[PDB]
Design a protein around this nucleic acid. Structure first.
Ligand SMILES: Nc1ncnc2c1ncn2[C@@H]1O[C@H](COP(=O)(O)O)[C@@H](O)[C@H]1O
Ligand SMILES: Nc1ncnc2c1ncn2[C@@H]1O[C@H](COP(=O)(O)O)[C@@H](O)[C@H]1O
Ligand SMILES: [Zn+2]
Ligand SMILES: [Zn+2]
Lengths: 199, 199
DNA sequence: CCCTG
DNA sequence: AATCAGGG
DNA sequence: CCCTG
DNA sequence: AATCAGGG
């Protein structure tokens, strides 16, 4: 009905989309249409019950889905993911370098209704990263890493006013107040530095 | 030294500026470079002491200057002013129509340092009127009309937070919140209505 | 979610 | 250039 | 004051 | 599109 159901077509009809880089009966790996890092993918369950379950509920009470998703990411999709990353970053990056530069998690408050796990590089260098909320949502407790212990899931209390905070580089700790454009330029430098040291 | 002395050249060297439409030893009438109404003029004293006196002090303690300025506006400059107005609005407007559509006053807090009296039409239809503070500064107590009794001069207390208020049409009382662009379009309509009824 | 004003 | 309402 | 970002 | 910091 609304924009919030936009991801639905990927799990209904993955055979129709070239940016669906993997599908089977259970899951779909699709490119993020508005990548917030050089590589940004979404792993979606095709299970019609679970797809509408809130990610925090998934983390709390659906561990078997959580384990399955992790199995895909470390297993049958790992080669695929490393290749996407090498194409998006550099061919000269090894699996080990890439593995330490990739994060996997749910947003604590999704906008899209179909459950989707973000798998993305750490750089946050991207034209689609256009505002502070974008950046903060992937670099704060709002981003719930897939290996978060259940007792440490973020709470309504801990998330309060999170998008209003000063901008901080995830890599070196430097602060930028609310100067989003300054952060952007800094992220670019951080990426060039990391790339040059990693190739 | 700064932009705040920009009006100075008009009283030093009125002979150098075609937009100085009147000068003598005592005063200068010059077009406002950024008119906030269809007609917007500035009347400046050439007296080197008084030019730097704050307008509220002028109103309180320099009545003879106040009376002289008013004498110019109603006397030797009246024909000149009506012609400027007819050229800026419409040739079909009589002195009487124009007289009731013109206001004369000081800003309570000037940005320019050389004392200048605003003489302008009421329309506030102008490309140079670009923000709410512009509009409010000419349509609130911040605009100190030249015939304000001294006991009713605005105070620091009365001016507080004035530029943060909702926008109100000076002619019909309609409110626009902070929708400046909506006010603009409305002012245009108000002007067409007034013009059509006045010609 | 995004875009536009 | 950062912040925000409206609409899809 | 204005303009630009 | 409204609000604001910086600079001239
Ligand atoms: N039509 C689309 N196709 C693919 N990805 C999308 C589409 N629309 C939005 N997205 C992404 O979906 C993600 C939703 O994240 P969330 O904030 O967790 O709901 C964001 O990263 C968006 O860039
Ligand atoms: N260089 C200039 N020449 C003529 N008028 C100007 C110039 N710069 C600014 N102004 C006007 O000077 C006025 C100053 O008003 P105030 O806010 O009372 O200081 C405003 O109406 C400006 O548009
Ligand atoms: Zn950094
Ligand atoms: Zn009105």
């Amino acid at each position: 009905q609304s924009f919030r159901d936009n991801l639905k077509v990927y799990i209904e009809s993955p055979e129709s989309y070239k940016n669906v880089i993997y599908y089977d009966d259970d899951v779909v790996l699709v490119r993020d249409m508005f990548p917030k890092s050089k590589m940004h993918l979404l792993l979606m369950t095709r299970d019609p019950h679970l797809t509408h379950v809130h990610p925090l509920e998934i983390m709390m009470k659906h561990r078997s889905l959580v384990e399955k998703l992790v199995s895909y990411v470390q297993g049958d999709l790992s080669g695929l993911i490393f290749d996407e990353a090498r194409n998006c970053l550099s061919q000269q990056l090894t699996n080990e370098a890439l593995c330490n530069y990739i994060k996997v998690g749910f947003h604590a408050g999704p906008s899209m209704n179909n459950l989707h796990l973000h798998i993305m590089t750490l750089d946050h260098v991207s034209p689609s990263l256009k505002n502070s909320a974008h950046y903060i949502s992937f670099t704060s407790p709002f981003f719930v890493k897939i290996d978060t212990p259940t007792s440490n899931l973020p709470t309504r209390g801990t998330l309060t006013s999170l998008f209003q905070e000063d901008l901080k580089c995830w890599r070196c700790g430097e602060t930028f107040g609310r100067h989003f454009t300054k952060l952007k330029a800094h992220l670019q430098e951080e990426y060039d530095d990391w790339l040059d040291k990693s190739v």
